Design a protein around this ligand. Sequence first.
Ligand SMILES: [Ca+2]
Length: 279
Amino acid sequence: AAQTNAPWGLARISSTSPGTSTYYYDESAGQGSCVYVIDTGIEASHPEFEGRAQMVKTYYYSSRDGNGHGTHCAGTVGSRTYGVAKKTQLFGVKVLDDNGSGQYSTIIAGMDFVASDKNNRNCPKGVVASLSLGGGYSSSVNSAAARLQSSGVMVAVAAGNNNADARNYSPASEPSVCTVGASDRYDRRSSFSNYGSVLDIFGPGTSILSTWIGGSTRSISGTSMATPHVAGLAAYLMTLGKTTAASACRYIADTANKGDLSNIPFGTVNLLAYNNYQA
Ligand SMILES: [Ca+2]
């Protein structure tokens, strides 16, 4: 399939080179997979989600997204226009309040929630979680992301936006999950992107157009925008039978565009997510 005039990040993800604007992908499109978006929630009613998004959990007075961030992330995973996996099921877990903040204890509970709740969903092709959040190093937070991953969920997490080594952040520093750095449309490391030996992959993170609350759209930037590209890609590859939750991060890094990014510090991977689709 071919989506013309796609957001640059979608095009980039299906291209060997920057500067193109059509997204190419197998039509299966993540059908039969599920993605949990663990964030400020999802505006499920947005026409762009077409009935495929649902809120399954909140730790606050409402399950509605009063911020927009979780909705933007969900749109990059699987909205019809702005999404990598246009046919996946989307499940929202609101661990962040409408200011985008959450206590570590709440965030950990939300991860363990998904690790059980996936047994209540129909996802024959596999399950992914996108965690666009972070804070200082915490072994409890890391350990929670490690459990989610070990229960059979492909876990993708933002590296962080501090322009600093991600070893100092959680769950970014957890070795067993997929830690994702941000790149821009000219294949440069995003200027805010964390880096370090703990990064597994880069995805599009600067000027990313996607869904927002109130039924609209907007462009914003962050490793939190790169993460859902990688999460959407894992779901898409799992429905294609190419990989599994346990090995998707590895597979994505093995099949990535290699050595194409600029401003990667010595010792950080130079790998950019790529769907290897031959149209
Ligand atoms: Ca990691």
